[PDB]
Design a protein around this ligand. Structure first.
Ligand SMILES: [Ca+2]
Ligand SMILES: [Ca+2]
Length: 269
């Protein structure tokens, strides 16, 4: 049958689902190693920005996993995503090695802006700031896209870029008790945290797998952002953002946690 991973219950996605919020009518770009076609996924489109590589054909597994968390289908198989009806686009910016270049990340961000994406999930990062990155972060945002980015996995009391950027919602990871995960980068520019430990999701070769990483926390917020937008169609990126942070369960220290745990019930009241 279908299983509901611990993180989707934790984020309280089902309660939102009970009120009919599935993420329908919302377009989500996933900037990653690609998305492979899988029985429990609905991929609407995408593009590849990797010299040498397809799109949806993920040679890594990381993008496929990420997308699983945001939207794997509510059915009697595999898993269930936060936003089971969200329109997924595979924006391939990282190759099978799982690395890219800031330009590949920037042209993906351009794609989203020119394609009308409501959400942009960037489960990637660098210790280094980039001019080409915050610019694209910036256009995407004028164009109405909500950039969701991972804090990083060094455990440093600082955050990675694009996350550091005022222009991006920065997402850190918690473990199963709701404590920050050891690798989870915190500090300045940290907006919120979501489940990032032992997260089971969709994976190439029509299988499922468990991964750890702030890279797994990010899709959880992209998902929530989709539910709110379905419920408040008129809202802009900045509105969804502030409401997502404001309805979070405070885990009492905005330095380690930003607002606290994203909360779909609460965020959709
Ligand atoms: Ca499923
Ligand atoms: Ca930020």
């Amino acid at each position: 049958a279908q299983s509901v991973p611990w993180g989707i219950s934790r984020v309280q996605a089902p309660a939102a689902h009970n009120r009919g919020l599935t993420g329908s009518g919302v377009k989500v770009a996933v900037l990653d190693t690609g998305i492979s076609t899988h029985p429990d996924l609905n991929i609407r489109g995408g593009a590849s920005f990797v010299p040498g590589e397809p799109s949806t054909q993920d040679g890594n597994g990381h993008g496929t996993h990420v997308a699983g968390t945001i939207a794997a289908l509510n059915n009697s198989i595999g898993v269930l995503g936060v936003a089971p009806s969200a329109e997924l686009y595979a924006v391939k910016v990282l190759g099978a090695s799982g690395s890219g270049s800031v330009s590949s990340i920037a042209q993906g961000l351009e794609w989203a802006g020119n394609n009308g994406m409501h959400v942009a999930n960037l489960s990637l990062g660098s210790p280094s700031p980039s001019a080409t990155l915050e610019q694209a972060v910036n256009s995407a945002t004028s164009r109405g896209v909500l950039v969701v980015a991972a804090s990083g996995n060094s455990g440093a009391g600082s955050i990675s870029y694009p996350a550091r950027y005022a222009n991006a919602m920065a997402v850190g990871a918690t473990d199963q008790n709701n404590n920050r995960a050891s690798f989870s980068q915190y500090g300045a520019g940290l907006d919120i945290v979501a489940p990032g430990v032992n997260v089971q999701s969709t994976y190439p070769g029509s299988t499922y797998a468990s991964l750890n990483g702030t890279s797994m926390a990010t899709p959880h917020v992209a998902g929530v952002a989709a539910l709110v937008k379905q419920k408040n169609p008129s809202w802009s990126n900045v509105q969804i953002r502030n409401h997502l942070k404001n309805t979070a369960t405070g885990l009492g220290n905005t330095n380690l946690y930003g607002s606290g745990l994203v909360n779909a019930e609460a965020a959709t009241r």
